Write a protein that binds this ligand. Structure first.
Ligand code: NAG
Ligand code: NAG
Ligand code: NAG
Ligand code: NAG
Lengths: 34, 34
């Protein structure tokens, strides 16, 4: 599945996790902000 | 963590639960209403 704000959760900034990768996390809400 | 509508679910009106407390529940939709 696509990485989204629904199938994931945040905790803290990117500095502490020993292996971490840059990728987009999609948000389904803001594409219809109006 | 901040008590949002994503951390929680609703059921009844407040009168039935013994020991319930009054507090705000945050909604992360509210800033996105452009
Ligand atoms: C994983 O292994 C490779 C090859 O030994 C190494 O270059 C890399 O730094 C390791 N990654 C982590 C997160 O330690
Ligand atoms: C990940 O993204 C941040 C912010 O652009 C950048 O500082 C960092 O160097 C990037 N790391 C890699 C491996 O792309
Ligand atoms: C908890 O105990 C105190 C002391 O007896 C009492 O005043 C209070 O009403 C009780 N709270 C609940 C939620 O029953
Ligand atoms: C809780 O909030 C309601 C609505 O403002 C109020 O009627 C009730 O008296 C409050 N109870 C307490 C214990 O603050």
């Amino acid at each position: 599945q696509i990485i989204t704000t629904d199938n994931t959760f945040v905790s803290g900034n990117c500095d502490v996790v020993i292996g971490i990768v840059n990728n987009t996390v999609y948000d389904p809400l803001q594409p219809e902000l109006d």
